[PDB]
């Protein structure tokens, strides 16, 4: 019922972006900098100044970047690699502070909870890293039998959600429950990979997840009771989901055939808009600090920036 532009505001070139569904290659910092992994390099783009930086480039051949994630205050960036490293970079002084090497396979997903960085791997394991201490690897969470492609701490820090190529969603506790590290909830209802994982910013217990091409559903959960609150058929893979508190909506990214973004009203899941423009499948979504703009990265080697959640479009 409001004006939503049908075209992106800006389009950034993303040459050589790796078209691998399971990877998480873009993140928009709280300081308004986009980190974008392009093959074996990471670029930073300031959305304020337009300045670009090539933060790093991997030396070894055939190696590639598999994930990026900014720490909450946006001055450090975690970078997971095909060679199973979780690197942390001080971007201001453009140097690598640590090269953490606990995983046995590529690190495709990352999520911070204050000074804890959690990393998910193609082996199906999740490691917690206390980045402040000598022995960084402080927990192993083992609840997936295939790649962990979705990993997300809740904004309140009380739960961690993980989604896997084994068609599984796990909700983990913030501390082990003296049965060891065991999920509080495990959902099997998706019949395809779950890369899309996102917590409701205004309801602590509400989680949204999305299934890949074999599944094509967005599901909303109450992680306390385990109940599915809602399930909707998106008619396409769902690669990412974000929530927006501006009008209480979610936005999802999709592939074949329309490669579109859909904005859904919460909780009715009424369609508010479809944003078309990409010419190959969307891979990731990330939100600006003011929440007005979503960046979508796609296999067409673009990032499109959509000002779709402006308060006061005028």
UniProtKB/Swiss-Prot annotation:
Q: Give residue ranges of the WD repeats.
A: 18-57, 60-99, 102-139, 143-182, 189-231, 233-274, 277-314
Oligomer status and interactors: Component of a complex with CDC20, CDC27, SPATC1 and TUBG1. Interacts with NEUROD2. Interacts with dimeric MAD2L1 in its closed conformation form. Interacts with BUB1B. The phosphorylated form interacts with APC/C. Interacts with NINL. May interact with MAD2L2. Interacts with CDK5RAP2. Interacts with SIRT2. Interacts with isoform 1 of NEK2. Interacts with HSF1 (via phosphorylated form); this interaction occurs in mitosis in a MAD2L1-dependent manner and prevents PLK1-stimulated degradation of HSF1 by blocking the recruitment of the SCF(BTRC) ubiquitin ligase complex.
Tell whether Chloroplast is among the UniProt keywords.
no
PTM note? Acetylated.
Result of altering residue 275 to R: In OZEMA14; uncertain significance; decreased function in metaphase/anaphase transition of meiosis I; does not fully rescue metaphase I arrest in CDC20-knocked down mouse oocytes; decreased function in positive regulation of anaphase-promoting complex-dependent catabolic process; shows normal kinetochore localization
Family under the similarity heading: Belongs to the WD repeat CDC20/Fizzy family.
Put simply, this protein is called Cell division cycle protein 20 homolog
Known disease link = Oocyte/zygote/embryo maturation arrest 14: An autosomal recessive female infertility disorder characterized by oocyte maturation arrest, fertilization failure, and/or early embryonic arrest.
Q: Which biological pathway?
A: Protein modification; protein ubiquitination
Q: Which GO terms describe its cellular component?
A: anaphase-promoting complex; centrosome; cytosol; kinetochore; mitotic checkpoint complex; nucleoplasm; perinuclear region of cytoplasm; spindle
- Which taxonomic lineage is given here? Eukaryota, Metazoa, Chordata, Craniata, Vertebrata
User: What pairs make up the disulfide bonds?
Assistant: none
Recorded GO terms, molecular function? anaphase-promoting complex binding; histone deacetylase binding; ubiquitin ligase activator activity; ubiquitin-like ligase-substrate adaptor activity
Give the protein's biological function: Substrate-specific adapter of the anaphase promoting complex/cyclosome (APC/C) complex that confers substrate specificity by binding to substrates and targeting them to the APC/C complex for ubiquitination and degradation. Recognizes and binds the destruction box (D box) on protein substrates. Involved in the metaphase/anaphase transition of cell cycle. Is regulated by MAD2L1: in metaphase the MAD2L1-CDC20-APC/C ternary complex is inactive and in anaphase the CDC20-APC/C binary complex is active in degrading substrates.
Phosphoprotein as UniProt keyword: yes
Task: Report any one BP term from Gene Ontology.
Answer: regulation of meiotic cell cycle
Sorted alphabetically, which keywords does the UniProt record give?
A: Acetylation, Cell cycle, Cell division, Centromere, Chromosome, Cytoplasm, Cytoskeleton, Differentiation, Disease variant, Isopeptide bond, Kinetochore, Mitosis, Neurogenesis, Phosphoprotein, Repeat, Ubl conjugation, Ubl conjugation pathway, WD repeat
- Effect in UniProt of substituting residue 47 to T: In OZEMA14; uncertain significance
Q: Where in the cell is it found?
A: Cytoplasm, Cytoskeleton, Microtubule organizing center, Centrosome; Chromosome, Centromere, Kinetochore; Cytoplasm, Cytoskeleton, Spindle pole
Q: Which domain of life is it from?
A: Eukaryota
Biological source species = Homo sapiens (Human)
């Amino acid at each position: 019922c409001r004006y939503i532009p049908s075209l992106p505001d800006r389009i950034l070139d993303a040459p050589e972006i790796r078209n691998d569904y399971y990877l998480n290659l873009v993140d928009w910092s709280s300081g308004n900098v986009l980190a974008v992994a392009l093959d074996n390099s990471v670029y930073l783009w300031s959305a304020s100044s337009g300045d670009i930086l090539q933060l790093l480039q991997m030396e070894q051949p055939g190696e590639y970047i598999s994930s990026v994630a900014w720490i909450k205050e946006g001055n450090y960036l975690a970078v997971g690699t095909s060679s199973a490293e979780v690197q942390l970079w001080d971007v201001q002084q453009q140097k690598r502070l640590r090269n953490m090497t606990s995983h046995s396979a590529r690190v495709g997903s990352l999520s911070w909870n204050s000074y804890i960085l959690s990393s998910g791997s193609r082996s199906g394991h999740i490691h917690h890293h206390d980045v402040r201490v000598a022995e960084h690897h402080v927990a192993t969470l083992s609840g997936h039998s295939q790649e962990v492609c979705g990993l997300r701490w809740a904004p309140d820090g009380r739960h961690l959600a993980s989604g896997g190529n084994d068609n599984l969603v796990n909700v983990w506790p913030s501390a082990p429950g003296e049965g060891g590290w065991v999920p509080l909830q495990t959902f099997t209802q998706h019949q395809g990979a779950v890369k899309a994982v996102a917590w409701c910013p205004w309801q602590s217990n509400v989680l949204a997840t999305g299934g890949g091409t074999s599944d094509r559903h967005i599901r909303i959960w109450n992680v306390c009771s385990g109940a599915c609150l809602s399930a909707v058929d998106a008619h396409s893979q769902v690669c990412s989901i974000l929530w927006s508190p501006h009008y209480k909506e979610l936005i999802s990214g999709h592939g074949f055939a329309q490669n579109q973004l859909v904005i859904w009203k919460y909780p009715t899941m009424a369609k508010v808009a479809e944003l078309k423009g990409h010419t190959s499948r969307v891979l990731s979504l990330t939100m600006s600090p003011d929440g007005a703009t979503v960046a979508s990265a796609a296999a067409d080697e673009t990032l499109r920036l959509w000002r779709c959640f402006e308060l006061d479009p005028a």
